[PDB]
Enzyme design. Structure first.
Site, PDB file in Angstrom:
ATOM      1  N   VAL A   1      -4.719  54.648  26.770  1.00 56.19           N
ATOM      2  CA  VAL A   1      -4.482  55.171  28.129  1.00 56.19           C
ATOM      3  C   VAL A   1      -5.699  55.852  28.773  1.00 56.19           C
ATOM      4  O   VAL A   1      -5.759  55.966  29.997  1.00 56.19           O
ATOM      5  CB  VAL A   1      -3.263  56.136  28.177  1.00 56.19           C
ATOM      6  CG1 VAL A   1      -1.989  55.401  27.757  1.00 56.19           C
ATOM      7  CG2 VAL A   1      -3.481  57.400  27.322  1.00 56.19           C
ATOM      8  N   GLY A   2      -6.640  56.324  27.949  1.00 54.80           N
ATOM      9  CA  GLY A   2      -7.888  56.924  28.425  1.00 54.80           C
ATOM     10  C   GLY A   2      -9.085  56.507  27.582  1.00 54.80           C
ATOM     11  O   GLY A   2      -8.976  56.374  26.360  1.00 54.80           O
ATOM     12  N   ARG A   3     -10.215  56.281  28.254  1.00 54.83           N
ATOM     13  CA  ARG A   3     -11.515  56.053  27.611  1.00 54.83           C
ATOM     14  C   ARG A   3     -12.562  56.871  28.359  1.00 54.83           C
ATOM     15  O   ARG A   3     -12.547  56.925  29.589  1.00 54.83           O
ATOM     16  CB  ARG A   3     -11.895  54.568  27.661  1.00 54.83           C
ATOM     17  CG  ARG A   3     -13.236  54.211  26.987  1.00 54.83           C
ATOM     18  CD  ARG A   3     -13.128  54.240  25.469  1.00 54.83           C
ATOM     19  NE  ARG A   3     -14.408  53.969  24.794  1.00 54.83           N
ATOM     20  CZ  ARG A   3     -15.253  54.878  24.286  1.00 54.83           C
ATOM     21  NH1 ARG A   3     -15.010  56.188  24.348  1.00 54.83           N
ATOM     22  NH2 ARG A   3     -16.374  54.465  23.696  1.00 54.83           N
TER      23      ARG A   3
ATOM     24  N   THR B   1     -16.362  59.764  27.689  1.00 54.77           N
ATOM     25  CA  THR B   1     -17.447  60.317  26.865  1.00 54.77           C
ATOM     26  C   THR B   1     -16.960  60.982  25.561  1.00 54.77           C
ATOM     27  O   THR B   1     -17.659  60.920  24.547  1.00 54.77           O
ATOM     28  CB  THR B   1     -18.335  61.298  27.681  1.00 54.77           C
ATOM     29  OG1 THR B   1     -17.518  62.279  28.333  1.00 54.77           O
ATOM     30  CG2 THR B   1     -19.133  60.542  28.737  1.00 54.77           C
TER      31      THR B   1
ATOM     32  N   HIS C   1     -11.421  58.010  22.746  1.00 54.30           N
ATOM     33  CA  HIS C   1     -10.285  57.174  23.148  1.00 54.30           C
ATOM     34  C   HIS C   1      -8.987  57.967  23.016  1.00 54.30           C
ATOM     35  O   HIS C   1      -8.840  58.728  22.059  1.00 54.30           O
ATOM     36  CB  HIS C   1     -10.193  55.940  22.241  1.00 54.30           C
ATOM     37  CG  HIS C   1     -11.517  55.332  21.883  1.00 54.30           C
ATOM     38  ND1 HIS C   1     -12.349  55.868  20.922  1.00 54.30           N
ATOM     39  CD2 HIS C   1     -12.134  54.212  22.331  1.00 54.30           C
ATOM     40  CE1 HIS C   1     -13.430  55.117  20.810  1.00 54.30           C
ATOM     41  NE2 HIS C   1     -13.324  54.106  21.653  1.00 54.30           N
ATOM     42  N   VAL C   2      -8.060  57.776  23.962  1.00 55.08           N
ATOM     43  CA  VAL C   2      -6.731  58.411  23.932  1.00 55.08           C
ATOM     44  C   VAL C   2      -5.643  57.327  23.964  1.00 55.08           C
ATOM     45  O   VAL C   2      -5.683  56.438  24.822  1.00 55.08           O
ATOM     46  CB  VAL C   2      -6.528  59.379  25.130  1.00 55.08           C
ATOM     47  CG1 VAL C   2      -5.214  60.162  24.999  1.00 55.08           C
ATOM     48  CG2 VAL C   2      -7.699  60.350  25.247  1.00 55.08           C
TER      49      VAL C   2
ATOM     50  N   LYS D   1      -5.807  61.056  20.062  1.00 57.98           N
ATOM     51  CA  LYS D   1      -7.219  60.963  20.464  1.00 57.98           C
ATOM     52  C   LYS D   1      -8.121  60.656  19.275  1.00 57.98           C
ATOM     53  O   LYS D   1      -8.131  61.413  18.310  1.00 57.98           O
ATOM     54  CB  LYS D   1      -7.678  62.279  21.116  1.00 57.98           C
ATOM     55  CG  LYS D   1      -9.159  62.322  21.539  1.00 57.98           C
ATOM     56  CD  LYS D   1      -9.529  63.685  22.090  1.00 57.98           C
ATOM     57  CE  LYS D   1     -11.025  63.781  22.333  1.00 57.98           C
ATOM     58  NZ  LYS D   1     -11.413  65.017  23.087  1.00 57.98           N
TER      59      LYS D   1
ATOM     60  N   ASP E   1     -15.335  72.873  33.416  1.00 54.52           N
ATOM     61  CA  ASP E   1     -15.226  71.576  34.096  1.00 54.52           C
ATOM     62  C   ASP E   1     -13.842  71.339  34.717  1.00 54.52           C
ATOM     63  O   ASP E   1     -13.294  70.229  34.657  1.00 54.52           O
ATOM     64  CB  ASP E   1     -15.606  70.430  33.137  1.00 54.52           C
ATOM     65  CG  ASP E   1     -15.927  69.124  33.865  1.00 54.52           C
ATOM     66  OD1 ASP E   1     -16.370  69.174  35.034  1.00 54.52           O
ATOM     67  OD2 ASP E   1     -15.733  68.040  33.262  1.00 54.52           O
TER      68      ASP E   1
HETATM   69  C1  LIG Z   1     -15.703  68.704  22.571  1.00 50.78           C
HETATM   70  C2  LIG Z   1     -14.451  69.303  23.153  1.00 50.78           C
HETATM   71  C3  LIG Z   1     -13.692  68.535  24.014  1.00 50.78           C
HETATM   72  C4  LIG Z   1     -12.536  69.066  24.570  1.00 50.78           C
HETATM   73  C5  LIG Z   1     -12.117  70.356  24.247  1.00 50.78           C
HETATM   74  N1  LIG Z   1     -10.902  70.896  24.868  1.00 50.78           N
HETATM   75  N2  LIG Z   1     -10.914  72.028  25.397  1.00 50.78           N
HETATM   76  C6  LIG Z   1      -9.708  72.289  25.917  1.00 50.78           C
HETATM   77  C7  LIG Z   1      -9.303  73.587  26.627  1.00 50.78           C
HETATM   78  C8  LIG Z   1      -8.355  74.361  25.687  1.00 50.78           C
HETATM   79  C9  LIG Z   1     -10.541  74.474  26.926  1.00 50.78           C
HETATM   80  C10 LIG Z   1      -8.556  73.227  27.937  1.00 50.78           C
HETATM   81  C11 LIG Z   1      -8.886  71.199  25.677  1.00 50.78           C
HETATM   82  C12 LIG Z   1      -9.693  70.305  24.992  1.00 50.78           C
HETATM   83  N3  LIG Z   1      -9.391  68.969  24.583  1.00 50.78           N
HETATM   84  C13 LIG Z   1      -8.432  68.120  25.140  1.00 50.78           C
HETATM   85  O1  LIG Z   1      -7.659  68.511  25.977  1.00 50.78           O
HETATM   86  N4  LIG Z   1      -8.347  66.812  24.659  1.00 50.78           N
HETATM   87  C14 LIG Z   1      -7.369  65.803  25.114  1.00 50.78           C
HETATM   88  C15 LIG Z   1      -5.892  66.196  25.118  1.00 50.78           C
HETATM   89  C16 LIG Z   1      -5.075  64.911  25.338  1.00 50.78           C
HETATM   90  C17 LIG Z   1      -3.708  65.208  25.967  1.00 50.78           C
HETATM   91  C18 LIG Z   1      -3.194  63.963  26.685  1.00 50.78           C
HETATM   92  O2  LIG Z   1      -1.780  64.039  26.761  1.00 50.78           O
HETATM   93  C19 LIG Z   1     -12.886  71.136  23.393  1.00 50.78           C
HETATM   94  C20 LIG Z   1     -14.049  70.605  22.840  1.00 50.78           C
END
Ligand SMILES: Cc1ccc(-n2nc(C(C)(C)C)cc2NC(=O)NCCCCCO)cc1
Lengths: 334, 268
Positions: A28-30, A32, A35-36, A53, A146
């Protein structure tokens, strides 16, 4: 040198992602960050969907380490929640199991912009929940860095119907949600920077178009600043005294003249999009979209605004019992 | 301030990795067939010293060394010394903690040269043979370590609450240096697995007051805390210095390391 009985015992008991979940052809997502997938449990105890993910790269990178470290500790209704971490030993890939969110603000705004603007009860409920999630993260010294409509997920049908989940999906890069200090070369991210982005999202929810939309053109970005000045006006010395301290201030002075934006103001912008300047919504927006970062209100202060005591009150279900008109996620194939 | 600073009471450290003393001692009985209780705590000290020296050679802050020290303890709290060689686990813990604490990825040549250089120059009395592991062994071991810890990476230490307590006293210059070293010394024991960091900090601050002969009876009495638990911690710290006196690390450790249970290899 590792004990054999220990190795085979763990290998036997270890849950592999392919054994527990069905996900082939459900991407559903691709982007940087990898993949999700929308995934179902093979041993059918529930029929609930799951976001699965696969982290881009292999092993335990700085990205994987940071995601695991934080989300393992974070626990709040308005923040996306990590359920399980799968470490695949064969290929050294890292898989993360999350809640599945069917919708997000990018797709919701795009749906209404295709017309019917967003219902006002819905906008208030969205902003309250976004503010609630960021207040929790900021209280724990976690900055998002972001915030944008694509990172504001919203749950579809089920027990959490219409609850906002803040996420970080990654990347097709725009500076439309970037506070002016970052555009003038601010070295560090701040709580204020996140609030500015929330102010942009709120303006977009009200009018259906991005408030600082800019064509596709280092820290200094002239065209993006020009757009902010067209909407907000050029800041007075009184309005932002420390603008001088910004590394790019001399470039700002070389390229811009305040005279150019003399008939520009946030009042004038929002009047054109049929939002009244003496409404409680506008007075809240103005405080979020303040140019000087030390003069922006905090997420806690925004949550206490009389906007959220005005009729109608925000709801847990953002859709407020109404039929969800927005389509489900289409699968990707590459 | 650091991420998750004020969250200890909802943290994975508190809810999962503050262990019961009797469960810790029950799981230890596997290794106590081979080693005595005395020899077992002597190994704890030794490997605490190894992680400190690895951290110093790589020029990492004490916070990173502490987090790495906790990862090591957590591992062998649940598993036997024969499961993974602790000579491999020790540098793997520093490598992982360095990522979590956001100092970065230590390079392959730099991590392996550090392990090699520390064992040769500072621990040749214990290790005659050169460091035998390459980076593929570290990356493998890192996966096993992350699994057992249940991906609980963020760790709270006593240094932050200690610093806040001495500022409240207004005796930062007098007491902090000594209290800080005593907190370092507690990592030679199981205390970080058994008590919250703020309780260990108070106990270290108390011993520093006794040693330097500064009356703080009224300050301590004004606190709302289980003072009986603080006394438990102090007895371990005082016992630790008697252990230190009587333990000749450099004469004993070669014989103790050879008494560790050896891995079962594959049948072949
Ligand atoms: C490298 C990296 C990438 C992403 C995160 N990171 N940081 C957050 C906050 C808590 C700050 C909102 C959520 C995330 N990661 C994510 O939210 N990843 C995807 C969740 C997929 C849900 C789809 O139904 C943290 C570190």
């Amino acid at each position: 040198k590792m004990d054999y009985d220990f190795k085979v015992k763990l290998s036997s008991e270890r849950e592999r992602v392919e054994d527990l979940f069905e996900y082939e052809g459900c991407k559903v997502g691709r982007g940087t960050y990898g993949h999700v997938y929308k995934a179902k449990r093979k041993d059918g105890k529930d029929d609930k969907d799951y976001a699965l993910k696969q982290i881009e790269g292999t092993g335990i990178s700085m990205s994987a380490c940071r995601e695991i470290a934080l989300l393992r500790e974070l626990k709040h209704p308005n923040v996306i929640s990590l359920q399980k971490v799968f470490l695949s030993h064969a290929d050294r890939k890292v898989w993360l199991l999350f809640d599945y969110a069917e919708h997000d603000l990018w797709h919701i705004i795009k749906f209404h912009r295709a017309s019917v603007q967003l219902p006002r009860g819905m906008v208030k409920s969205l902003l309250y929940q976004i503010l609630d999630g960021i207040h929790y993260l900021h209280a724990n010294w976690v900055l998002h860095r972001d915030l944008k409509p694509a990172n504001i997920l919203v749950m579809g049908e089920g027990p959490e119907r219409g609850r906002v989940k803040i996420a970080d999906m990654g990347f097709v890069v725009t500076f439309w949600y970037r506070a002016p200090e970052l555009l003038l070369g601010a070295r560090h991210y701040t709580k204020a920077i996140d609030i500015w982005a929330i102010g942009c999202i709120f303006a977009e929810l009200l009018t259906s178009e991005p408030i600082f939309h800019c064509r596709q053109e280092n820290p200094y970005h002239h065209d993006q600043l020009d757009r902010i000045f067209n909407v907000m006006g050029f800041p007075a010395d009184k309005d932002w005294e420390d603008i001088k301290k910004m590394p790019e201030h001399s470039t700002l002075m070389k390229d811009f003249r305040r005279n150019t934006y003399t008939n520009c103001s946030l009042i004038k912008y929002m009047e054109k999009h049929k939002v009244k300047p003496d409404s409680k919504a506008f007075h809240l927006l103005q405080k979020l979209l303040t140019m000087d970062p030390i003069k922006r209100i905090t997420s806690e202060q925004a949550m206490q605004d009389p906007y959220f005591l005005e009729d109608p009150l925000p709801t847990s279900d953002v859709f407020a019992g109404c039929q969800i008109p927005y389509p489900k996620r289409e699968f990707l194939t590459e | 301030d650091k991420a998750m600073a004020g969250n200890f009471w909802q943290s994975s450290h508190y809810l999962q990795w503050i262990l019961d003393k009797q469960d810790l001692l029950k799981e230890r009985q596997k290794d106590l067939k081979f080693l005595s209780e005395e020899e077992y705590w002597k190994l704890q000290i030794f490997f605490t010293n190894v992680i400190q020296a690895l951290g110093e050679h790589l020029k990492l802050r004490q916070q990173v060394i502490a987090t790495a020290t906790v990862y090591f303890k957590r591992f062998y709290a649940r598993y036997s010394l024969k499961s993974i060689d602790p000579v491999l686990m020790a540098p793997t813990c520093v490598f992982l903690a360095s990522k979590v604490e956001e100092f970065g990825v230590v390079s392959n040549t730099r991590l392996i040269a550090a392990a090699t250089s520390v064992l040769k120059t500072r621990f040749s009395y214990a290790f005659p043979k050169e460091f035998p592991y390459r980076m593929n062994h570290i990356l493998e071991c890192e996966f096993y370590l992350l699994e057992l810890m249940d991906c609980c990476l963020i760790v709270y230490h006593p240094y932050r609450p200690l610093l806040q307590y001495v500022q409240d006293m207004g005796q930062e210059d007098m007491l902090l240096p000594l209290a800080w070293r005593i907190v370092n010394d507690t990592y030679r024991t199981d205390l970080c697995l058994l008590y919250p960091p703020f309780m260990i900090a108070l106990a270290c601050l108390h011993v520093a007051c006794v040693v330097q002969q500064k009356d703080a009876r009224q300050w301590f009495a004004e606190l709302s805390v289980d003072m009986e638990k603080i006394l438990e911690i102090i007895r371990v710290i005082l016992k630790l210095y008697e252990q230190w006196k009587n333990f000749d690390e450099r004469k004993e450790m070669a014989t103790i390391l050879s008494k560790m249970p050896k891995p079962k290899p594959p049948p072949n």
